[PDB]
Amino acid sequence: AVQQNKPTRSKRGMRRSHDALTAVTSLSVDKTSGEKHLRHHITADGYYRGRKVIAK
Amino acid sequence: MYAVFQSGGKQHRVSEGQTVRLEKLDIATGETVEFAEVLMIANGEEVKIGVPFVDGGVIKAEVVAHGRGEKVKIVKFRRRKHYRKQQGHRQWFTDVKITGISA
Amino acid sequence: MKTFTAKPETVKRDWYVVDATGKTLGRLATELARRLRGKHKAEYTPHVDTGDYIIVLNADKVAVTGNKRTDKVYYHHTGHIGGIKQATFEEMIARRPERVIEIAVKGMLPKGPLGRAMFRKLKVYAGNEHNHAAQQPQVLDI
Amino acid sequence: PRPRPRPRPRPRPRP
Amino acid sequence: VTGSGKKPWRQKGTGRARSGSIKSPIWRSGGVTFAARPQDHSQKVNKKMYRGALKSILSELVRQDRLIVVEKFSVEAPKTKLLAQKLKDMALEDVLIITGELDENLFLAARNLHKVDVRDATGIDPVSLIAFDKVVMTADAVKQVEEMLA
Amino acid sequence: ARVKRGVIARARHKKILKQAKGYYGARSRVYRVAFQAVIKAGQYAYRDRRQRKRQFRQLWIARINAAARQNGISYSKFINGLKKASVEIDRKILADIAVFDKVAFTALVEKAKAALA
Amino acid sequence: METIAKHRHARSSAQKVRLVADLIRGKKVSQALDILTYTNKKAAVLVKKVLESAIANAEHNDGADIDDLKVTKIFVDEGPSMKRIMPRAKGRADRILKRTSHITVVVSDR
RNA sequence: UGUAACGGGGCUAAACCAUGCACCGAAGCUGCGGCAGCGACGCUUAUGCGUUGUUGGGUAGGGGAGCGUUCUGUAAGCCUGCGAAGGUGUGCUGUGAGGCAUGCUGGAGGUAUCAGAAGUGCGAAUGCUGACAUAAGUAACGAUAAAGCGGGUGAAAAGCCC
RNA sequence: CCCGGCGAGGGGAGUGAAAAAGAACCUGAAACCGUGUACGUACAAGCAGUGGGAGCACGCUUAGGCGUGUGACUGCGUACC
Helix, strand or coil: CCCCCCCCCHHHHHHHHHCCCCCCCEEEEEECCCCEEEECCCCCCCCEEEEEEECC | CCCEECCCEEEEEEEECEEEEECCCCCCCCEEEEECCCCEEECCCCEEEECCCCCCCCEEEECCCCCCCEEEEEEEEECCCCCEEEEEEEEEEEEEEEEEECC | CCCCCCCHHHHHCCEEECCCCCCEEHHHHHHHHHHHCCCCCCEEEEEEECCCCEEEECCHHCCCCHHHHHHHEEEEEECCCCEEEEECHHHHHHHHHHHHHHHHHHHCCCCHHHHHHCCCCCEEECCCCCCCCCHEEEEEEC | CCCCCCCCCCCCCCC | CCCCCCCCCCCCCCCCCCCCCCCCCCCCCCCCCCCCCCCCCCCCHHHHHHHHHHHHHHHHCCCCCCEEEEECCCCEEEEEEEEEHHHHHHHCCEEEEEEECCCCCHHHHCCCCEEEEEEEEECCCHHHHHCCEEEEEEEHHHHHHHHHHH | CCCCHHHHHHHHHHHHHHHHHCCHHCCCCHHHHHHHHHHHHHHHHCCCCCHHHHHHHHHHHHHHHHHHHHHCCCCHHHHHHHCCCCCCCCCCHHHHHHHCHHHEEEHHHHHHHHHHH | CCCCCEEEECCCHHHHHHHHHHHCCCEEHHHHHHHHCCCCHHHHHHHHHHHHHHHHHHHHHHCCCCCCCCEEEEEEEEEEEEEEECCCHHCCCEEEEEEEEEEEEEEEEE
């Protein structure tokens, strides 16, 4: 339940080796408006695959 | 041309031109020193093995320094017995430069 | 001055071929361990692998005195719940003839990364024909 | 800063 | 220490160390086991030891030619300017003015000068005969300090 | 006269941590652990000052015994032959002779072989 | 030209922000802003506000060349801890730390 | 629990008996240099010695000799805004506690030598106070009555308004 | 003045001997947490040090070699009270 000796910075650091975040690195430019967005996601303006899908 | 002689408790393999660090002698800084206790003289397939010493061989060397060595920390410790002793030491040395190897 | 210590990048290793036909296992593997460790060279360094490569042939032709051919049991444990296994000398020769010298040499070798490094230079072959003719291995009469 | 309920004691024996 | 004599926590049960009072010296806000008291540091000196030391001090003064005996020492006015004019003519700057009779005319003139001090012949002490570089005697002070030491 | 032990205690801990530089983990930052490490290192330094004279001597013996057997003589007979030949060259020089100049060691082996035989 | 730009007393632990800050170390400001736009962390919008503040300081206070601008050094240093009391069971108290951090972003052109 | 009654490899001599000669082998002994204690010593003389002999593992404990800090006299003297103390590094130095010089910060106090007085030297006491780690970004986010959508506000709306 | 939510915070400018004196404000130690640089480290078992020691990176006069930092491998080595 409790530890007998405290973990070091090594044991803490080697545990956090897999806690690093992952980048997206796959930004897709829009077909018509040419704005960056995620794959299979609409843009902030409301464009998806060139069509103004949201009209809002 | 490298020769082997005896010194203050140890032997050295020295050659003419190089310098060697050995134990402190009572020699002035500027005068020369002669080592007649040569043990072996090898001159490039001309070898001489003294028994015990080489007959007619002497090393005419020249002293350059008489300083003290590095400080070593002697630590005496006895666990759970309330004993601990600290002591330092700087051994005296003498830098000796070999200037002459007589066959 | 400071005594000589052999540099690992400047060592001069050699290739040797010995024949294990009619040889006593202890008397042979010890000499192989001596050459692998580098105790025969005047430039021996305890922390530097200065030995030579050894190619031993006829691994199954090694001989043992007395009744050790059927009574020398080679124990090894699998690390499991009840996995202790044993094999005699006669059985191990038929199954893994090359493993007899390797275990005998490794126990005669120092333990550690350096001892494992010098064990890599021991080439064992059950037959009398090896595939290391490219290194020009000379015959070692021992 | 409060203490703790203390470990529950076992039934004490005798001779 | 202004505080309570109440036990902080229980003797057992708690995981804390054993404590009986918050005024303990191993605690903050109160401590000092062996606290000082107003005491007397003066130590007794024998009469022959005190008189013997003064005679040995005066004997070393004439060996280091620091004792200057004169027939008289008195200023006409209590002004410190004319007293500072006086000892400068005899090439003295840091002296102990000791006279047989302490006159207020000389007492006032040496009150502001740091390096001089005026005393009465009966009121001599060892430290001023040592701290000051030179010491000057008038004629009748020598005959009064001779009998008081004997 | 209250004496504040601030400057003296900090300088005492800094001296210990200065000697403990290079140690792993808390043995170079924590004064409690470093002081044990420095004392243990000082004990090892005193101990290994004797083992250095042992390890080097047995190293030279291995050097001599290796080169002597290359010339066809055991170490036990080589030192005995050198002793009978009135030769006082120590194992430190003899190990360095065999490493560098193989020619001089062969003359020393032949000198010890003539005295032994 | 260095143009340091930091945000002290950020309401977040330094451990959580260092995960975000490690993503944009050694990257162009154009790519770093795009990375921080689609990163779903609270520290992602925290350091994005510092980064755009660092970009604006690199054009108004001194220098030029916004497109040729690289985030060379970035680090998160822990700040003061605001300490509260969390009432726990059995009448005992466990003291919690509202950990803060100092997000320092320095971006140059070389 | 696993060979597990040569340390292991392994050994028919690398096992046992007798003999001999070598070698390894301790901080033991010898060689060199250095320090200290004690007893003698030719004669030096409040002292070093060409010396000479011998000693120097150590708990409790006893004896002897020292280092460092604060304050006081020394000392209205000395250093110091061309930079004190403290802090942080380096190079020397003594057997040692330590000391000297100096790079940087710092900014106005410190203090020679010789004496005196201690609130005079912290690793431990489940020691006290304050700060920061640890487990760990883990449990948990506090009745399983339940939320879903649209519009508005706002930098940002699952929790605000309709 | 600019970024930022007419925020918080920061960067410029200015005052100031000094803003590594900005109100959390003289001096800012250690524990602890970081970033950069040099080396080692993903086949190698243990009080994590010590003796030896190759390699690498620098700092130098010398053109021979020392020093600093890391340190493969290796004998020895089971913390303090």
